[PDB]
Amino acid sequence: EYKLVVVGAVGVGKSALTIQLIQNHFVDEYDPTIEDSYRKQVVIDGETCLLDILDTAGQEEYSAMRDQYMRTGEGFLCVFAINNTKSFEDIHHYREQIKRVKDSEDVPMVLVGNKSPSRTVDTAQDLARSYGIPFIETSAKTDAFYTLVREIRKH
Amino acid sequence: MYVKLISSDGHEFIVKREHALTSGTIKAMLSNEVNFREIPSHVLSKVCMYFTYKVRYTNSSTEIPEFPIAPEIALELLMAANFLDC
Amino acid sequence: PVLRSVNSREPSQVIFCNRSPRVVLPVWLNFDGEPQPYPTLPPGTGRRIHSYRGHLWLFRDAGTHDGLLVNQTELFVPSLNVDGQPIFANITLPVYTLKERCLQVVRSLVKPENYRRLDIVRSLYEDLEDHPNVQKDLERLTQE
Amino acid sequence: MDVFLMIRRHKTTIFTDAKESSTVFELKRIVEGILKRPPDEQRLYKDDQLLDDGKTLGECGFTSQTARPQAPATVGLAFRADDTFEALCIEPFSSPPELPDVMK
Ligand SMILES: Cc1ncsc1-c1ccc(CNC(=O)[C@@H]2C[C@@H](O)CN2C(=O)[C@@H](NC(=O)CCCCCN2CCCN(c3nccc(-c4noc([C@@]5(C)CCCc6sc(N)c(C#N)c65)n4)n3)[C@@H](C)C2)C(C)(C)C)cc1
Ligand SMILES: Nc1nc2c(ncn2[C@@H]2O[C@H](COP(=O)(O)OP(=O)(O)O)[C@@H](O)[C@H]2O)c(=O)[nH]1
Ligand SMILES: [Mg+2]
Pairing of strands A37-39, A52-55: antiparallel
Q: Report d(CA B42, CA A95) in Å as an integer.
A: 54
Closest-CA distance, D34 to chain B, in angstroms, reads 8
Question: Rounded to the nearest 10 degrees, how much is the dihedral formed by the CA atoms of A34, A37, A38, A43?
Answer: 150
Domain range annotation of chain C: 11-92, 98-142
Buried residues in A84-104 as b, exposed as e (16+ CB within 10 A):
beebbebbeebbebbbbbbee
* Domain extents in chain B: 1-86
Count of domains for chain A: 1
Pick the CATH number of D2-103 from 1.10.540.10, 3.60.20.10, 3.20.20.140, 3.10.20.90: 3.10.20.90
Note which residues in 4-33 of chain C have CB less than 8 A from chain B.
Answer: 19-21
Q: Kindly report the CATH number that applies to the domain delimited by B1-86.
A: 3.30.710.10
Containing domain of residue A125, as a range? 1-155
CB C92 within 8 A of CB C19: yes
What DSSP character marks residue C38?
-
- What CATH number was assigned to the domain covering residues C98-142? 1.10.750.10
* Closest CA to ligand 1's atom 64: A62
Domain ranges of chain D: 2-103
Q: Cα–Cα distance between A80 and A110 in angstroms, integer? A: 10
What's this structure's resolution in Å? 2.2
CATH number assigned to the domain comprising residue A29: 3.40.50.300
Query: How close D96 gets to chain C, by Cα (Å)?
Result: 15
Contact partners, residue C122, CB within 8 Å, separation at least 6: none
CATH, range C11-92 = 2.60.40.780
Give A99's contacts in chain C (Cβ within 8 Å): 39
Contact A55, A18 (CB under 8 A): yes
- Burial per residue of B36-73, b for 16 or more beta-carbon CB atoms within 10 angstroms, e otherwise: beebbbbbbbbbbbbbbbbbbbeeeeeebeebebebbb
A31 C-beta closer than 6 A to ligand 2:
no
